Amino acid sequence: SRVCQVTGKRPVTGNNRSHALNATKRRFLPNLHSHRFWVESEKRFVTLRVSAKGMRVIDKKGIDTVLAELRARGEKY
């Protein structure tokens, strides 16, 4: 699925409002990338399906603090 693993951001729907205001259904896809992260505590390259905002969150919190949040809600990594 196209679900961000860190921030939990999922694709939502929307409308393509034209010049004549014609409504057409579409989706809002996140800027997801499969980035390979390194951790010191486990000594392993850990790949994660993260977004562009997800990389911004994981820099401030830390690579090990975010994995504590995946540990609490039972996610796999």
């Binding site: 390194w38 820099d59 401030k60 830390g62």
Partner: protein, 50 residues
Amino acid sequence: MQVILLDKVANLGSLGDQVNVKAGYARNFLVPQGKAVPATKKNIEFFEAR
């Protein structure tokens, strides 16, 4: 951003410097390989004591 150096780094480093670095040179080279740490104003006293 604001990372502080820790090693025998080339000509921007003197074993700890507050520099203005880009995010792409920060991670995957200076974050977790060694040699740097993000300055979140908690680690600025923690690793200088080390």
